[PDB]
Every structure is written in C-alpha cells, then in structure tokens.
C-alpha cells in the first residue's frame, strides 16, 4: 500500500473497535439493497425481495462475516495485499465469476457503514486512509483475473 505510517495507524486503530460480525452483515446487506443487481450471485440465499428481507436473511449476514473476516486478515498484510489475496483472486475469477467491479461497490458501502457506526470518529483524514485500503483490497482481489 501507499499508506503513511500515520495513515496505517489510523486504519489499524479504528479497526480495533470493529465488530466484524455486525459490520460484515450490514455491509453485505446494504450492498444487496443499494445495488440490487449484485443479488445475481446470491439466489440460493432466499428472498432478498425487501430491505427487511435482505437485512434479516441469516445467509446474508453469515456471508458478510466471512467476507469481512478475510478483509480483516488482509489488514495484517497491508504491505502485500497482492500476495494475501492471490488464491482468493483466482477463486473469484475461475470459480465464482464475480466481476471485480463488485469489489469496488462493496468497498464504498463498507466506508458508508464505518461512517454510520463511528460518526464523529470517522473524520475526513480517516475516511481518506480507508478509501486507499478499500481500493487496494479491490485491486488485489482483481489481480489474478484473466
């Protein structure tokens, strides 16, 4: 990453306060609602007919936790996101056929969820470092597409 020690510290420290369980379910569910077309990959999850139905769907919430988990661990290899997401990158390409654009939609939703959650704490300088991380994650994950 092109993170400043200062920027690294800011990311790291807010993360420390995150409930991945809660944030993962909310980020993924929001995605399914804001950008309804991402639902094409989660037909087997049930009825995503309403915000309520999406936000309530346990399959969604549980997928959300699996996703932020992986993201969470990526934050420990901020200096080689590429090597940390290589296998996950292949998988997404080769098995799931997920368009990398989706990785960017989620990142932005993630940022709206953090702001939502931390209010005051999520300052312009803090969002700025987060924007760089979400872009970095998305790029890493997309890296092995061919």
């Amino acid at each position: 990453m092109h993170l400043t020690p200062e920027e690294k510290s800011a990311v790291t420290a807010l993360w420390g306060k995150v409930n991945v369980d809660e944030v993962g379910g909310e980020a993924l569910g929001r995605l399914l609602v804001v950008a309804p077309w991402t639902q094409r990959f989660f037909e087997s999850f049930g009825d995503l007919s309403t915000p309520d139905a999406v936000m309530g769907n346990p399959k969604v919430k549980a997928h959300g936790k699996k996703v932020l988990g992986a993201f969470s661990d990526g934050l420990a290899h901020l200096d080689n996101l590429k090597g940390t997401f290589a296998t996950l990158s292949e998988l997404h390409c080769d098995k799931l056929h997920v368009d990398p654009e989706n990785f960017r939609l989620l990142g932005n939703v993630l940022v709206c969820v953090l702001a939502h959650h931390f209010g005051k704490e999520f300052t312009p300088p803090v969002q700025a470092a987060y924007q760089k991380v979400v872009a970095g994650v998305a790029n890493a994950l997309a890296h092995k597409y061919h």
């Binding site: 709206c112 702001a115 939502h116 999520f122 312009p124 969002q127």
Partner: protein, 141 residues
C-alpha cells in the same frame, strides 16, 4: 427512475438535514478532497484548507441545489437546466467525478443521520444522487 417510495424516502431524509445542509455540503467537499485528491484539479483557485470560507460557501451552493432538486424531484431536468448548462459548457467537470461527490455525500449523511440512514433510505439517496449526476452531465455532448 425514482419510484414513489424513493421520492418519499429522499424527501424524508433531506427533510431531517434542515438547517445543516450547508455544513453537510461543506463536509462532503472536504471528504472528497481528501479521499480523492484528483478532484482537487477543478478548484485550483480555491483555498482547500480546512475551514476555508471558499469551501464553506461552495458547500452551501451545492447543498442548496440538492434541496431544489428534492423539491422538484418530479421535474429535475427542468429544475436543473441552468446547472446542467454550466457544467456542460463552462466547468466541464469529467463525469467520473460526480460519482465521487455522490459517495462522500452518502458518507456524510450516514455519519449525521444514523436513525434515518436505513438500508432502504441509503438505496434511494443513492439512486437520487445518481439521477442528479445524469441530469448534470446530460448536455456534455
């Protein structure tokens, strides 16, 4: 295309912004400038430092235009004619940038209207900013 639910949700959300839209306008710009530094290329003539009156004022201007848009949610194209003109023939901001301001504006509302920033409201505001962006870039060519 904004559904009736959508127009409702938007008016509600914006309804709660109230006397703070200007500050939210200003805050969104600041978040845009820091997160997407390339957007600064359009304001070489501004003092982009924290708390600049140039930024605060611009913030109000933007805020006001959104208000007017919510108010004429049914006739945007018309309520924003002049603004679409200005952007297409004078400012000529590249279209990618509208998506960046729209995003910094969600983040700002989210951070300020917790109870109101529900998943359905979030989806609506997004479509809305999208629609607004479409309108402002419709006369580009």
């Amino acid at each position: 295309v904004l559904s009736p639910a959508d127009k409702t949700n938007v008016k509600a959300a914006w309804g709660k912004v109230g006397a703070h839209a200007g500050e939210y306008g200003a805050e969104a710009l600041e978040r845009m400038f820091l997160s997407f530094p390339t957007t600064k290329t359009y304001f070489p003539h501004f003092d982009l430092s924290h708390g600049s009156a140039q930024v605060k004022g611009h913030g109000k201007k933007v805020a006001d235009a959104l208000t007017n848009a919510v108010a004429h949610v049914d006739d945007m194209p018309n309520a924003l004619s002049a603004l679409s003109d200005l952007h297409a023939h004078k400012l000529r901001v590249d279209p990618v940038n509208f998506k960046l301001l729209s995003h910094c504006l969600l983040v700002t509302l989210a951070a300020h209207l917790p109870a109101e920033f529900t998943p359905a409201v979030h989806a609506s505001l997004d479509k809305f900013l999208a629609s607004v962006s479409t309108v402002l870039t419709s006369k580009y060519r």
